[PDB]
Each structure stands twice: as structure tokens, then as C-alpha cells.
């Protein structure tokens, strides 16, 4: 086990050596903090990207020492110590060519090493937040429950819904009504907000179903998801939900696009009240009328609307079922297309000597955070972990590093918590 000094030194050296998009960005960002220029900033950020003031304020909190460095593909975190033992985390999210989309410096998210499931529960519990932890081992003869808190509660899950959209897509591929190499076309009407990168492509951009689905999962690409949902059609997605593993499809009817959640959730307040008072028919009618180019921007987001049904609600059993179903879907697809999409982004640094495959999905909306993994070892033993939080106030949940970090610690302690 590396001692504190060893660990910090290893992180510092790894940051310096990391020849990757994340390494480049993390070093540049750290340079902003440790150094003493508008065009250089412009070149490092997404083209649609106050900042000088933000950097002045960050710098006022140093000097900083790198204590940990956690690059994970397009997302990365650097743990910093400032004077007097105060710690911060620098968080980076990149686009597909390594341009910075999000850069934040925030008080450290503290997660202890976990020994028991009660450590997880007592760490996670936050007054005003509903949470759920569900962990199982998949077997021939059903699931062995390792730990459960409120798995039966249906909760909003944000982009977990893209797991159902993936199963719907695979079902249509198997039927031969859609193909992996079929071309989808981005239009102004199909463009959604981030998470994702496909929104930054020009109008008329032609992309395969394969690459669109890949980004839908690996980047949680909302525009990719909406492109797939448009191609398949809402009714086709909704008719798939029962078989895909959802216990009460009516909770996700009409099955919303991300564009619809954004536009309805944070646009016209009257239109949102009409949703609340309407039945399924009136809601479908409202959505059809709402079709068009988005008016809502990222800056408009904030207030919670999941409690109005403007999200995607499922219980923990539903998540386990969709993941187990996807594992089955992947196995049946001898081309490996499904597998490539599902395993592209595991959301953490994975011990590949232990885990042969890992599926991962995150979801987040104001007042909503969730992470789930399927992890299968080289013998073929699979575990599923489902973490969920919901609140009426987004500040009670935060940016998701807490819930994901709790996931990371469970997986680090798999020998105690999953495979004991």
C-alpha cells in the first residue's frame, strides 16, 4: 500500500507523464493554478465556451500540491491540497477532441474506505435526500442480494433511460428493421443539450447508428440518444420496455427524449403546468406540439422537475434487469458491436485483472443522481451495483462525485462487499 508521500509523488509523476487528452488538459488547467491570455483559453475550450475572474479566485486559494490524479477517458479529477490541509478537487470533462467542456475547482468530496455495507449507508445518508443502494450477484437461478436499501422505490434516474433505449435498438437490429451502418442525420430539431458532443456537429451531419449508439452510452450523449429515439420511434421504444425489464412501463410513458425533458422541464411554465394536469393522451399531444428547435439553454436549468414526472423513473430491480438483459444482448451479438458500445466507458479506473467486463451508466438531472455498474469477473461471475439519489434541492446532491466515489470505494472493496 502506498503511503501518503508515495501516493502524492505517484500522482504527480503520472500527471506529468500522461500523454493523453486528459493529461494535456489536466496539465494546462494545473498551469492556470500554479503559474503567474484570452486566445489561449479560447483554444483549449469547446468553441461555444468571466473566466479570468474565476481563475483569479481559484489561484487565491493556493498554493496547490497534487495529491491524487484520476484520469478516466473524457473525465478526470485531480485532488489538491492548499495551505493548512484544506483540500480541493479540480474536475475536467472533455469533448471528443480533448477540448475542455467543464472545468471546476471545488471543496474536496470526502469518501472513506468502506469495510461494511453499513459504512456505505451511513456515509451516503443525507437529510432531505432519498437514496437507494442495491448490490446483487447474478446466478443461473436468480439474484443473490448482497445489500439493499429501498430498491423497490421508483426514483428518477436521468440517462439510465439510455439503457432501455439501447435494448430497444438491439431488439430492432435483431428484427432487421434498423442496421448498425444505417445513416442518421442531425437536424436543428434533433439537436439536444450536453451531456454529449454530437450537438456540436453541423446541421446535416450524417452518422451511423453504431457510432450514434456508442456516443449515446459512452458519452451519455443526449443528442445521440434523441437521434436513436427518433429513428426507432416513441411507440417502438415504449412497447419494448416490459420485455427489456421495466416493472411498470406507465411510469415512463410518454417515454421522453432528453430534448423533451429539457424543453418541458425548464421552458414555458404554463406548458409545464399543462403536463402536470394532463393524462397520457394530453401529454403526447403536448409533446407533439412542442416539437421543434430547442429554446431552453444550459443556463436555464436549475429547479427540480423530476417530481412532476419530467425524468425517467424506475426502481433498482429495473436497472438490474436492463443491465442483465444487455449482458444477454451482448452475448447473442457475435459481431461484438453491442459489447464495444457497452464497455467503452466504465466510469472508473477498473482492475482489468479482476474484471473481464464492466458496463456502466450514469444519470443526472436537477435533484437526481445515479450510477450503476455491471461487473463480471474472468470466471463469469457477474455483480450489479445500483446507486440512486433524489432531492427537492440540487445542492443536497451536488455534482455526483460523491455518489460515484462511493461506487468506486465499493468496487475497490469488492472482496469485502461483493465477492466475500
In the chain, CATH 3.40.710.10 sits at: 113-257+311-420
Half-sphere exposure of 190 (CA within 13 A, CB side): 24
Give this entry's resolution in angstroms.
Answer: 1.7
Computed over its alpha carbons, how large is the radius of gyration of the chain? 21
What are the residues whose beta carbons fall under 8 Å from the beta carbon of 106, sequence distance 6 or more?
Answer: 88, 89, 91, 399
Cell matching residue 202: 453541423
- Give the chain as a 3 state SS string: CCCHHHHHHHHHHHHHHCCCHHHHHHHHHHHHHHCCCHHHHHHHECCCCCHHHHHHHHHCCCCCEEEEEEEECCEEEEEEECHHHCEEEEEEEECCCCCEEEEEEEECCCCCCCCCHHHHHHHHCCCCEEEEEEEEEEECCEEEEEEEECCCCCEECHHHHHHHHHHHHHHHHHHCCCCCCCEEECCCCCCCCCCCCHHHCCCCCEEEHHHHHHHHHHCCCHHHHHHHHHHHCHHHHHHHHHHHCCCCHHHHCCCCCHHHHHHHHHCCHHHHHHHHHCCHHHHHHHHHHHCCCCCCCHHHCCCCCHHHCCCCEECHHHHHHHHHHHHHHHHHCCCCHHHHHHHCCCCCCCCCCCEEEEEEEEEEECCEEEEEEEEEECCCCEEEEEEEEEECCHHHCCCCHHHHHHHHHHHHCHHHHCCC
Structural biology method used: X-ray
| Domain at 258-310: CATH code | 1.10.8.620
Contacts 24+ apart (CB under 8 A), 199-202: 199/223, 200/46, 200/47, 200/48, 200/95
Half-sphere exposure of 293 (CA within 13 A, CB side): 5
Of 2.60.120.10, 3.20.130.10, 3.10.450.280, 3.40.50.12780, the CATH number of 1-112 is: 3.10.450.280
Find where cell 394532463 sits. 278
In the chain, CATH 3.10.450.280 sits at: 1-112
In order of 37, 128, 364, 400, the CA distances from 103 in angstroms are 17, 28, 18, 14
The size of the chain, in residues, is 420
Q: According to the CATH classification, is domain 113-257+311-420 in 3.40.710.10?
A: yes
Amino acid at each position: 500500500v502506498p503511503t501518503p508521500a508515495e501516493a502524492a509523488l505517484a500522482a504527480q509523476t503520472a500527471l506529468a507523464a500522461d500523454d493523453s487528452p486528459m493529461g494535456d488538459a489536466a496539465r494546462w488547467a494545473m498551469g492556470l493554478l500554479t503559474s503567474s491570455r484570452p486566445e489561449d483559453v479560447a483554444a483549449r475550450f469547446i468553441p461555444t465556451f468571466n473566466f479570468a475572474e474565476t481563475v483569479r479566485e481559484w489561484r487565491s486559494k493556493g498554493p496547490f500540491t497534487v495529491r491524487a490524479y484520476h484520469p478516466v477517458a473524457h473525465k478526470g479529477w485531480v485532488v489538491l491540497s492548499a495551505p493548512a490541509g484544506v483540500r480541493y478537487i479540480l474536475s475536467l470533462t472533455l469533448d471528443s477532441s480533448g477540448l475542455i467542456r467543464i472545468l471546476t475547482l471545488k471543496p474536496e468530496t470526502v469518501i472513506p474506505d468502506m469495510v461494511t455495507w453499513n459504512d456505505v449507508e451511513e456515509t451516503l445518508h443525507t437529510p432531505g435526500v432519498q437514496h437507494s443502494v442495491y448490490a446483487v450477484r447474478l446466478t443461473p437461478d436468480g439474484h443473490e442480494v448482497l445489500h439493499a436499501s429501498a430498491p423497490e422505490r421508483p426514483m428518477p434516474t436521468g440517462s439510465a433511460y439510455k439503457l432501455y433505449l439501447m435494448r430497444a435498438l438491439v431488439a430492432e437490429i435483431e428484427k432487421g428493421t434498423v442496421g448498425w451502418d444505417e445513416i442518421l442525420t442531425l437536424t436543428p430539431e434533433l439537436r439536444s443539450l450536453p451531456t454529449g458532443d454530437m450537438q456540436d456537429l453541423p446541421d446535416g451531419t450524417r452518422v451511423t447508428v453504431r457510432e450514434t449508439a456508442h456516443k449515446m452510452i459512452a458519452l451519455s450523449d443526449n443528442t445521440g440518444a434523441d437521434l436513436v429515439a427518433d429513428r426507432l420511434g416513441r411507440e417502438v421504444v415504449e412497447r419494448s420496455l416490459a420485455a427489456a425489464g421495466h416493472h411498470d412501463p406507465s411510469l415512463m410513458r410518454p417515454f421522453l427524449t432528453s430534448h423533451e425533458v429539457f424543453e418541458l422541464g425548464w421552458g414555458d411554465p404554463e406548458r409545464r403546468a399543462e403536463w402536470v394536469r394532463q393524462d397520457e393522451a394530453g401529454r403526447r399531444e403536448l409533446l407533439e406540439k412542442m416539437a421543434g428547435v430547442m429554446t431552453v439553454r444550459g443556463s436555464d436549468l436549475g429547479a427540480t422537475v423530476h417530481q412532476l414526472g419530467i425524468d425517467w423513473h424506475m426502481d433498482a430491480f429495473d436497472v438490474v434487469r436492463v443491465l442483465e438483459g444487455l449482458l444477454q444482448d451482448s452475448g447473442r451479438d457475435t459481431s461484438g458491436t453491442v459489447e464495444e458500445i457497452l464497455t467503452a466507458y466504465p466510469g472508473l479506473l477498473i482492475d482489468e485483472e479482476r474484471w473481464r467486463r464492466v458496463y456502466f451508466k450514469a444519470g443526472a438531472s436537477p435533484g437526481v443522481m445515479m450510477f450503476c455498474w455491471l461487473l463480471q469477473d474472468h470466471a463469469g461471475i457477474s455483480y450489479v451495483l445500483v446507486l440512486r439519489q433524489s432531492a427537492d434541492e440540487q445542492r443536497l446532491i451536488g455534482d455526483g462525485l460523491f455518489l460515484r466515489g462511493i461506487g468506486a470505494k465499493i468496487i475497490e472493496a469488492e472482496a469485502k462487499l461483493l465477492s466475500s
